[PDB]
Design a protein around this ligand. Structure first.
Ligand SMILES: Nc1ncnc2c1ncn2[C@H]1C[C@H](O)[C@@H](COP(=O)(O)OP(=O)(O)OP(=O)(O)O)O1
Ligand SMILES: [Ca+2]
Length: 430
DNA sequence: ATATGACGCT
DNA sequence: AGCGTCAT
């Protein structure tokens, strides 16, 4: 009753760039705009591995982790853009730089948490309060929400997409309690008005479109974001949760897409997130541990407390390449040449990072994978990173792994290496 | 048939 | 410290 917390204390958004690498390439090359197209890496491998897909190409069944030659069988007129290759490997600089463009714009509105190359969470709680004061209790016109969906509406006693969107939005707004500045629903609404403005600024200043979710915490914000894509935003209210969760596969909730989620389903004999509400907090803790059980008990009720972390920059800067099948690294001289290649890119990214962001990495993590391990991470070791020099980094990396070689023959490497990974970590202010 | 990044556990 | 999980 009066002491039951409802998880309605913050306004949180998740902004997600639509088919991001595709948009970066389509901005650059107007001939790709409004076409089925994809971004590929490593051309000579069956036309290249597809890593991003325009929405026009998705309608043909083109997906990520399809070979371009195979995608062409579904979509013969698919256009392609290829990732830059430097020193024999894919180089994602263009996309990291485009990401900075977007993250700098979002940072003007609120403090962001960089979640990936193209996602950021936003804590809008404070900006909502401030915008609510300015508003002076005047209503919110639908015109302030031109791309917003209200999940679960319309409901109760037209047949085209936009018509249904507006119907839901009218029911939502007609019901709003603009009289109370502490109404959660009103706070989410104003949050959505801000996110409209944020998304318009991104598109104006970059050409890039995105989707967004607005709710009371990160999990619901992320869920909401995926509900109406591309180029749209979705508001998931607290009151929307019971219906939304009643048929929501558990695996759709962030952190449940893998093994834990699969064990929730199997152990408990359930399918949908809402079905969790019938278990006590102690039962969930018993099955899944103290932390996971507490988290699940609250989350199935729409409640989650993970903060939007004030962090706009990555905490690690890494470079890696796989060397599959026959290309696996079999000689000492190959291993050293590729470590050098990785180390050169790393040095380049590190030096840029030091000038831009006033910090230095201090630990180098070296990871490899020998042929056999189904296992991705076969072995991991660190050393000190004391100088941004590619030859030292590559030599150091070699030293900390050189005894993984089982070959009595000096010049050979056994078993062959199928992955090398160099990662700069443990940043200090500079 | 074939590249990153964050965080949890021990 | 080194390994595992989950995600873009
Ligand atoms: N497994 C991967 N390997 C390489 N690059 C990837 C991988 N997954 C994602 N990316 C890159 C390419 C994407 O454009 C970008 C953002 O990922 P993601 O948001 O999952 O897809 P997307 O932005 O391309 O489509 P969407 O409209 O579904 O957001 O990161
Ligand atoms: Ca995206």
């Amino acid at each position: 009753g009066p002491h039951m917390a409802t998880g309605q204390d913050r306004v949180v958004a998740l902004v997600d760039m639509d088919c991001f690498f595709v948009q970066v390439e389509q901005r650059q090359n107007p001939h790709l705009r409004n076409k089925p197209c994809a971004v590929v890496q490593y051309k000579s491998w069956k036309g290249g591995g597809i890593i991003a897909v325009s929405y026009e190409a998705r309608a043909f069944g083109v997906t990520r982790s399809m070979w371009a030659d195979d995608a062409k069988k579904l979509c013969p007129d698919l256009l392609l853009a290829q990732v830059r290759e430097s020193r024999g490997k894919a180089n994602l600089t263009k996309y990291r730089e485009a990401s900075v463009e977007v993250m700098e714009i979002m940072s003007r509105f609120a403090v962001i948490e960089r979640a990936s190359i193209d996602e950021a969470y936003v804590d809008l709680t404070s900006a909502v309060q401030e915008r609510l004061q300015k508003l002076q209790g005047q209503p919110i016109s639908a015109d302030l929400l031109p791309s917003t969906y209200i999940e679960g509406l319309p409901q109760g006693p037209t047949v085209q997409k936009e018509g249904m969107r507006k119907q839901g939005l009218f029911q939502w707004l007609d019901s709003l309690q603009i009289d109370n500045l502490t109404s959660p629903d009103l706070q989410l609404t104003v949050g959505a008005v801000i996110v409209e403005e944020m998304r318009a600024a991104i598109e104006r200043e970059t050409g890039f479109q995105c989707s967004a979710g607005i709710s009371h915490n990160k999990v619901l914000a992320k869920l909401a974001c995926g509900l109406n894509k591309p180029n749209r935003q979705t508001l998931v209210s607290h009151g929307s949760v019971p219906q939304l969760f009643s048929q929501m596969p558990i695996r759709k909730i962030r952190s449940l897409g893998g093994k834990l989620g699969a064990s929730v389903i199997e152990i408990l004999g359930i399918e949908y997130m809402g079905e969790l509400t019938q278990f006590t907090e102690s039962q969930l803790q018993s099955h899944f541990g103290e932390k996971n059980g507490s988290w699940l008990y609250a989350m199935c009720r729409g409640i989650e407390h993970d903060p939007v972390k004030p962090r706009q920059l990555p905490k690690t800067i890494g470079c890696s390449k796989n060397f599959p099948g026959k290309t696996a690294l079999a000689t000492r001289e190959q291993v050293q040449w590729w470590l050098l290649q990785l180390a050169q890119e790393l040095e380049e990214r590190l030096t840029k990072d030091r000038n831009d962001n006033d910090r230095v990495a201090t630990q180098l993590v070296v990871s490899i994978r020998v042929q056999g391990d189904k296992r991705l991470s076969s072995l991991r070791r660190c050393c000190a990173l004391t100088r941004y020099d590619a030859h030292k980094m590559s030599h150091d990396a070699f030293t900390v792994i050189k005894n993984c070689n089982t070959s009595g023959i000096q010049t050979e490497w056994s078993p062959p290496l199928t992955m090398l990974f160099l990662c700069a970590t443990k940043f200090s202010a500079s």
